[PDB]
Design an enzyme around this catalytic site. Sequence first.
Site, PDB file in Angstrom:
ATOM      1  N   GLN B  29      40.897  24.639  26.447  1.00  0.00           N
ATOM      2  CA  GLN B  29      40.490  23.455  26.990  1.00  0.00           C
ATOM      3  C   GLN B  29      41.359  22.207  26.756  1.00  0.00           C
ATOM      4  O   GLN B  29      41.814  21.390  27.453  1.00  0.00           O
ATOM      5  CB  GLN B  29      39.073  23.160  27.247  1.00  0.00           C
ATOM      6  N   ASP B  84      31.899  25.623  20.699  1.00  0.00           N
ATOM      7  CA  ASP B  84      30.569  25.113  21.082  1.00  0.00           C
ATOM      8  C   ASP B  84      29.656  25.067  19.818  1.00  0.00           C
ATOM      9  O   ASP B  84      28.883  24.211  19.465  1.00  0.00           O
ATOM     10  CB  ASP B  84      29.704  26.126  22.007  1.00  0.00           C
ATOM     11  N   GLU B  85      29.900  26.165  19.054  1.00  0.00           N
ATOM     12  CA  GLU B  85      29.218  26.355  17.507  1.00  0.00           C
ATOM     13  C   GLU B  85      29.472  25.368  16.539  1.00  0.00           C
ATOM     14  O   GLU B  85      28.354  25.009  15.769  1.00  0.00           O
ATOM     15  CB  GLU B  85      29.258  27.867  17.186  1.00  0.00           C
ATOM     16  N   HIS B 109      31.395  21.820  28.816  1.00  0.00           N
ATOM     17  CA  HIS B 109      30.098  23.119  29.279  1.00  0.00           C
ATOM     18  C   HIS B 109      28.852  22.625  28.753  1.00  0.00           C
ATOM     19  O   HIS B 109      28.822  21.599  27.686  1.00  0.00           O
ATOM     20  CB  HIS B 109      30.623  24.319  28.400  1.00  0.00           C
ATOM     21  N   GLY B 135      41.511  27.641  29.987  1.00  0.00           N
ATOM     22  CA  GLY B 135      42.198  26.616  29.706  1.00  0.00           C
ATOM     23  C   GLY B 135      43.756  26.430  29.835  1.00  0.00           C
ATOM     24  O   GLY B 135      44.241  25.670  30.609  1.00  0.00           O
ATOM     25  N   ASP B 192      27.522  29.729  34.039  1.00  0.00           N
ATOM     26  CA  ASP B 192      28.689  29.831  33.157  1.00  0.00           C
ATOM     27  C   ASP B 192      28.561  31.047  32.335  1.00  0.00           C
ATOM     28  O   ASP B 192      29.464  31.822  32.090  1.00  0.00           O
ATOM     29  CB  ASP B 192      29.125  28.680  32.529  1.00  0.00           C
ATOM     30  N   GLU B 196      30.585  34.793  32.748  1.00  0.00           N
ATOM     31  CA  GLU B 196      31.588  35.329  31.613  1.00  0.00           C
ATOM     32  C   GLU B 196      31.097  36.477  30.955  1.00  0.00           C
ATOM     33  O   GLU B 196      31.684  37.301  30.829  1.00  0.00           O
ATOM     34  CB  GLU B 196      32.077  34.091  30.310  1.00  0.00           C
ATOM     35  N   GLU B 232      47.972  47.207  36.950  1.00  0.00           N
ATOM     36  CA  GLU B 232      47.679  47.050  38.597  1.00  0.00           C
ATOM     37  C   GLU B 232      46.411  45.892  38.890  1.00  0.00           C
ATOM     38  O   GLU B 232      46.473  45.325  40.091  1.00  0.00           O
ATOM     39  CB  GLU B 232      47.458  48.268  39.200  1.00  0.00           C
ATOM     40  N   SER B 253      45.108  51.904  50.864  1.00  0.00           N
ATOM     41  CA  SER B 253      45.335  52.949  51.962  1.00  0.00           C
ATOM     42  C   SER B 253      44.013  53.123  52.186  1.00  0.00           C
ATOM     43  O   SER B 253      42.942  53.008  51.596  1.00  0.00           O
ATOM     44  CB  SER B 253      45.821  54.231  51.147  1.00  0.00           C
TER      45      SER B 253
END
Lengths: 322, 335
Positions: B29, B84-85, B109, B135, B192, B196, B232, B253
């Site tokens: 971020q 965050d921690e 967040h 980010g 959020d 995730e 793919e 298909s």
Amino acid sequence: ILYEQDVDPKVIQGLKVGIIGYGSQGHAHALNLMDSGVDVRVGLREGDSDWKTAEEAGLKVTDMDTAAEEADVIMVLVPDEVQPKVYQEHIAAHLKAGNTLAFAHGFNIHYGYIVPPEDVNVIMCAPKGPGHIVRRQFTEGSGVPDLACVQQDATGNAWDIVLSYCWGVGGARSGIIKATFAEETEEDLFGEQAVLCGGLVELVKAGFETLTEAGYPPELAYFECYHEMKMIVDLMYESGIHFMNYSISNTAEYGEYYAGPKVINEQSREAMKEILKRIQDGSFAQEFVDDCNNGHKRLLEQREAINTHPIETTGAQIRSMF
Amino acid sequence: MAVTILYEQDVDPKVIQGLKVGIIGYGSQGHAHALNLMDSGVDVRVGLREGDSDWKTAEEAGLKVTDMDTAAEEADVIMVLVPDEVQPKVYQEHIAAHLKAGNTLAFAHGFNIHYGYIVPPEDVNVIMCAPKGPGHIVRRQFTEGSGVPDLACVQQDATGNAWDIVLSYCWGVGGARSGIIKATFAEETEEDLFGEQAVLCGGLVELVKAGFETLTEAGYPPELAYFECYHEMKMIVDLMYESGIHFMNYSISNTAEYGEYYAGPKVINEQSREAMKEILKRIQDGSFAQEFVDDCNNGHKRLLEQREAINTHPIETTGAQIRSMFSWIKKEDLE
Ligand SMILES: NC(=O)c1ccc[n+]([C@@H]2O[C@H](COP(=O)([O-])OP(=O)(O)OC[C@H]3O[C@@H](n4cnc5c(N)ncnc54)[C@H](O)[C@@H]3O)[C@@H](O)[C@H]2O)c1
Ligand SMILES: NC(=O)c1ccc[n+]([C@@H]2O[C@H](COP(=O)([O-])OP(=O)(O)OC[C@H]3O[C@@H](n4cnc5c(N)ncnc54)[C@H](O)[C@@H]3O)[C@@H](O)[C@H]2O)c1
Ligand SMILES: CC(C)N(O)C(=O)C(=O)O
Ligand SMILES: CC(C)N(O)C(=O)C(=O)O
Ligand SMILES: [Mg+2]
Ligand SMILES: [Mg+2]
Ligand SMILES: [Mg+2]
Ligand SMILES: [Mg+2]
Ligand SMILES: [Mg+2]
Ligand SMILES: [Mg+2]
Ligand SMILES: [Mg+2]
Ligand SMILES: [Mg+2]
Ligand SMILES: [Mg+2]
Ligand SMILES: [Mg+2]
């Protein structure tokens, strides 16, 4: 894995290709082939709305019988379930000794729904990707990967022909894998059912529904579960799970390791095995063909349930504003 | 409504353009908020620890970089973009003392504020601009004239223009191009964490992995299992993202579309669905938060044991070999 140095472009550049169908694969194969200097014609029915489109794209379009008759290589790009009838009515009688009958999925040949004559090549160039993208990546200077397969080598140079064709359609850019019709059939049915279409769609729908059912707004759930999926898959596609996991927060990364196996659980793994079992032993193929003979009945019901789902109506609104 | 998606006509660019922004940190971020805001005409500085090796990286991107304390001191808006921690400690040791009455403290967040790990003073705005994307792509899409959507949230409106600032901040990082939704700090934290976990990271990665393994375990070469289950996936998702599932299902298909409907409820099954609701409960009640913080306080013990394992998994080693051969990667390497 094979690349550009492993294939000879001139082989397919000297053959006349007839693409039967102009749907998802047909347009990408047709257009990529023509862009690659190949002599192509598309074989369509009278009254097919795409006749003019294919024409505006700059391709020769004619009826199926003529395309078959004119072609050295005839690529069947119509729905798997309609290939046996279409083969017999518009293809078979136009096959000469030394001609190549080509597919993009080994389904018909592998399960025995079509048994070509003993005196033609029977090959497959199966792009590992949806036709719109087979086309787009090709135009962007990239290319979707193909399995190249040869079920019958009548001429002794079927390999050079299937590999030049993969080159034609962008395959040598990202990679060609030699495979058997049995192998492509089985791995392709499995991927689209387990992971690419069944697994993925239902995963997104399940998370969207979990949120909306818990009182979060559908718009919010679409951005979170559906829209953002593209961005996560983009990083993996270019740089790996290890890059994507580095990009996300350690909160998200922890949450992945902790929640992944609860969501994709030991039952989901048994389901994947069972899915492959039913592919392998032919009973899924029989189920699909049955539904098709029943007028796509189950396919159509399930189509209508997804198309009317809040994830689809909310998504249609949001995207209309971009 | 419920909800109103907001766009460029709902926001005022001049507001964030009139404020000094301090981005604390330069990770996923960090680099994206910092560069998009600088490109949008904002006065940006990056706040980093003395001797951090990303300092040159940020300076190479043309940004003003200084120590965190100075960044926070100078800034009108202090945006917290470290893990965050570590936020509670970084905030206590390096941000709090630099906050002046009428400053704004900003997060991407809501974890720390919502759960109480950081209690801000009552003389500043407490806001959030949460992009709903990674980010690197908040950055890329912006440079492409698109923009990742944002949630705009205000825990504390100290100055009486916190909303104008958070909405304008979103514009500055490209949210106006696709959509901004007003949400609470609680609401964003919960949805959020859930996305995730259930869907975007845990879901997806386990799905691709179990897909790949199912094939290898049955004897198909890992190269083919990679093209099929992994490579793919970007293609299918692109069609959904652009045009809806209906169109993706149109593109594939009838064989594949029948298989989708048949196999979906099997792989993403009733236990998958119960799992998601339990996952959401542990998010709402704070248990998941306490478990993550405990793991970080305990040597990142689970995090790092799983990270090692998936990073050296055959899907990764085989994928790295496979991608290294792509004509566009070799083309790009040449650049
Ligand atoms: N991207 C994919 O959809 C995808 C990917 C890999 C392989 N394949 C394989 O490619 C082949 C074609 O798949 P598709 O999904 O591109 O097909 P599709 O469903 O897009 O086929 C539509 C085309 O076939 C024509 N068609 C339909 N019914 C017909 C009939 N009765 N007679 C003559 N023409 C008819 C339509 O007019 C149209 O031109 C299949 O063997 C499929 O398994 C498809
Ligand atoms: N895509 C995403 O990663 C994403 C998406 C939405 C929201 N968020 C949120 O943005 C915030 C940051 O997430 P991120 O993933 O960009 O972080 P990151 O893990 O990329 O952050 C690493 C940066 O933080 C600095 N840092 C790490 N520990 C530090 C410490 N003890 N002291 C000072 N600096 C330290 C590093 O030096 C580096 O600049 C979090 O609140 C997260 O939940 C992230
Ligand atoms: C488009 C995709 C899911 N795919 O690879 C197929 O083979 C198909 O549509 O049948
Ligand atoms: C999936 C990821 C990019 N994300 O959106 C996050 O909220 C995160 O990294 O914490
Ligand atoms: Mg396929
Ligand atoms: Mg298929
Ligand atoms: Mg990160
Ligand atoms: Mg991480
Ligand atoms: Mg950061
Ligand atoms: Mg200050
Ligand atoms: Mg998120
Ligand atoms: Mg998050
Ligand atoms: Mg189709
Ligand atoms: Mg279809």
